[PDB]
Structure 1
């Protein structure tokens, strides 16, 4: 049994000469030489079986990624686990090895306008496919965008994804939420459960602004502070946009605030392409109903050199709506065992 940095990393004989890459959202990720395809691959070790929530997320990641097939979405190449439910303690997910993620790249590298434009095109082309399957990613952020040595981009980590449920999107003010703070749409903190496609567009907007300056645009330090940052740049919402917020706690909180002026995008990003800034404005719209949708974003002049709807595929079928929140970890283990069976010899 192979070992890395104290931990069992039990992937062989197919996968050899392991090197530690890092820690991701679920534990240890290694690279390894795939003896069958004769390439290095990325392998993540998942140990979810004690907790229903880790089980739920591992199952979502696995079901979604195995169903999706798209050039801008990470696939699953292989899944390693024990031959029986009883013996199964860890799951290893094998994926294409990528050179970096956008988080590391933004810490270290200035992006040309040409790179920003190509990265944004690829994120939206991947998201068009995701949203066409009636799926919300709900955790788009630079660390969830992988890049290879030629800057092909792939969306990863569908652990927090859900089937879109707009008619059930309303909630009260300051309702707890799971997805990463800096990339959370303002309505999350106000009156939204994050069950509509507009939640992902806000996150892409945040990513775009971060590509323009290498710094997060709304680096809140905590839940309501995230909204301080957003309003500090967008300015006070209009009467129309407040009238759309029926919940009194949410609306009266906004009305309690001193007037804030819009900060013009060209002042925040004086070196940015004016077309990139027009699209940024449309993605970072306060009112989620007025926020641009993925297919309109692809059609925006900023992306004219790449836009080609005939080469921006959609999913053959929408995804199976929701069913895991009430399933215990024992049933969830069985479903994980079942979903991974195709990678077993035979």
Structure 2
């Protein structure tokens, strides 16, 4: 066992090992990792075991981060607790490499060059292909969930910019039976945004959002229309069939034609027809970076627990289990 030291940052108390120095708020804190001489990010889980929800939510995030090992996905450097036993196990801290900024700020500086868009979207798809391997769906892919530093290297993550604007329609209206291409749809909204600099579908609510989406992609067709279970949506769609649609080559005038093609294949209402992460990686638009041998999938991930209903102390224990069994990366 290490040796921690107390400290209070903006009301929050912090008990981390001497190994980490210069804690500076950013709730997460920026710190210096004395063991590697690298700057890190330290997130103290708020009230991890306050309710069964937080306990499961706390356990879920720990299991995930411990499983993610890809250059384009946030990875767990360290997970510690000032607790010396399970009984006194009330605090959880997670550690990762510090980073530059959201794809927000890193875009506020410009509109991004076509090569920058290729490289950025290319790393999102590479990280996406990986996590999709473990049958994991992000469900909240958006500018603020992407970390990019100076080198222009990207990494996906989830902080827990309306997520709305990027949400796929199957998921926004809910039919309970989606797929991983919910994420690809979001990628299309971000990609489009980098190329144009402006938000593709800046709706005000779920009703506004849909109007925006349809005015571009058009109203559902027979094939897509006979796949909608809920009559409620079925009726709405077949009613508001009035929205002057568009033709991508126009909506994105002057963009790499390879780029507008990709979008066409990402921004489809039919999740059954939407391109996948692995398929987009092979799109000619990324021909400059694509390498089928450096685009790894993930080991299978056990999501059994998602369906279990346990006490707070049980989720707490499994969480403690995960904390002790942590094997730091090389």
Q: Displacement of 1:286 after TM fit?
A: 0.7
Q: Displacement of 1:119 after TM fit?
A: 0.6
1:338 equivalent in alignment to 2:321: yes
TM-score (norm 1): 0.86
Change (3 A) 1:327 1:220: farther
Change (3 A) 1:340 1:283: same
Match of residue 125 from structure 2: 124
Match of residue 203 from structure 2: 220
Would the aligned equivalents of 2:86 and 2:317 in 1 still touch at CA under 8 Å? yes
The whole-number CA distance in structure 1 between the counterparts of 2:14 and 2:195 is 39
Q: State which of 13, 19, 25 in structure 1 corresponds to 2:24.
A: 19
Would the aligned equivalents of 2:20 and 2:32 in 1 still touch at CA under 8 Å? yes
RMSD: 2.2
Match of residue 41 from structure 1: 40
Match of residue 73 from structure 1: 73
Where structure 2 has 5 or more consecutive residues not aligned to the other structure, the ranges are 1-5
Q: State which of 285, 288, 301 in structure 1 corresponds to 2:268.
A: 285
Deviations 1:252-310 (A, max 9, x none): 11111142232222333223211111101111101111111111111111111111111
TM-score (norm 2): 0.90
Match of residue 58 from structure 2: 58
Q: Displacement of 1:9 after TM fit?
A: 2.1
Runs of 4+ in 1 over 6 A off after TM superposition: none
Q: For structure 1, which segment, 251-260 or 320-329, has the greater mean C-alpha deviation from structure 2 after superposition?
A: 320-329
Q: State which of 292, 315, 323 in structure 1 corresponds to 2:298.
A: 315
The whole-number CA distance in structure 1 between the counterparts of 2:159 and 2:177 is 15
SS at match of 2:325: helix
Deviations 1:158-196 (A, max 9, x none): 86xxxxxxxxxxxxxxxxxxx932221111244432651
Change (3 A) 1:158 1:17: closer
Where structure 1 has 5 or more consecutive residues not aligned to the other structure, the ranges are 22-27, 160-178
Number of equivalences: 320
Q: For structure 1, which segment, 245-254 or 90-99, has the greater mean C-alpha deviation from structure 2 after superposition?
A: 245-254
1:110 equivalent in alignment to 2:88: no
SS at match of 1:210: helix
Would the aligned equivalents of 1:282 and 1:291 in 2 still touch at CA under 8 Å? yes
Match of residue 31 from structure 1: 30
Deviations 1:114-152 (A, max 9, x none): 111001110001111111112112221111111122011
Change (3 A) 1:343 1:186: closer
Within-5 A mapping of 1:128-167? 128-157=129-158
Within-5 A mapping of 1:196-211? 196-211=179-194
Q: State which of 1, 4, 7 in structure 1 corresponds to 2:9.
A: 4
Would the aligned equivalents of 1:134 and 1:319 in 2 still touch at CA under 8 Å? no
